[PDB]
Design an enzyme around this catalytic site. Structure first.
Site, PDB file in Angstrom:
ATOM      1  CB  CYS A  98      25.210  58.504  41.180  1.00 61.30           C
ATOM      2  SG  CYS A  98      24.462  59.716  42.292  1.00 61.30           S
ATOM      3  CG  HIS A 144      27.258  61.490  44.765  1.00 58.81           C
ATOM      4  ND1 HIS A 144      26.948  61.901  43.488  1.00 58.81           N
ATOM      5  CD2 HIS A 144      28.134  62.400  45.250  1.00 58.81           C
ATOM      6  CE1 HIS A 144      27.601  63.015  43.215  1.00 58.81           C
ATOM      7  NE2 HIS A 144      28.330  63.339  44.268  1.00 58.81           N
ATOM      8  CG  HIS A 204      24.148  62.951  40.144  1.00 67.95           C
ATOM      9  ND1 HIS A 204      24.616  62.529  41.370  1.00 67.95           N
ATOM     10  CD2 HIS A 204      23.732  64.228  40.319  1.00 67.95           C
ATOM     11  CE1 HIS A 204      24.493  63.510  42.247  1.00 67.95           C
ATOM     12  NE2 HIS A 204      23.958  64.551  41.634  1.00 67.95           N
ATOM     13  CG  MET A 249      28.123  60.052  38.822  1.00 65.36           C
ATOM     14  SD  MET A 249      27.741  61.021  40.299  1.00 65.36           S
ATOM     15  CE  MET A 249      29.126  60.581  41.347  1.00 65.36           C
TER      16      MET A 249
HETATM   17 CU    CU Z   1      26.101  61.355  41.877  1.00 59.71          CU
END
Ligand code: CU
Ligand code: LCY
Length: 106
Positions: A90, A40, A93, A98
């Site tokens: 993130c 992340h 993602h 996210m």
């Molecule tokens: Cu992430």
């Protein structure tokens, strides 16, 4: 003066931050911990922060990817920072949404 903790990847195994939305007072600490399904990172956009200040967003964002568990990133919202809503995400993602939001209360 407290310390809020946010997990990067829900214990359920979802691609979120938890708690996603947060409410803090000036002087508080936020601490992101690498949890489930890494890697992340933490990005704020130009125009998601108060006043759309590019320099601010870049001052807060930890653009670098984090991989090991327990790896953590900390921001303290001292008096130095303006009030309003900071929105982050993130990058790997992004697609899966996210996303999180920290509100500075008064
Ligand atoms: Cu992430
Ligand atoms: C988002 C805001 C901006 O102007 N740039 C270059 C971005 O990455």
């Amino acid at each position: 003066m407290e310390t809020f903790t946010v997990k990067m990847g829900a214990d359920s195994g979802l691609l979120q931050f938890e708690p996603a939305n947060v409410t803090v007072h000036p002087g508080d600490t936020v601490k992101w911990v690498n949890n489930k399904l890494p890697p992340h990172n933490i990005l704020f956009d130009c125009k998601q922060v108060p006043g759309a200040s590019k320099e601010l967003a870049d001052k807060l964002s930890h653009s670098q990817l984090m991989f090991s568990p327990g790896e953590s990133y900390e921001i303290t919202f001292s008096s130095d920072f303006p009030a309003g809503t900071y929105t982050y995400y993130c990058a790997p993602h992004r697609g899966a949404g996210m996303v999180g939001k920290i509100t500075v209360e008064g």
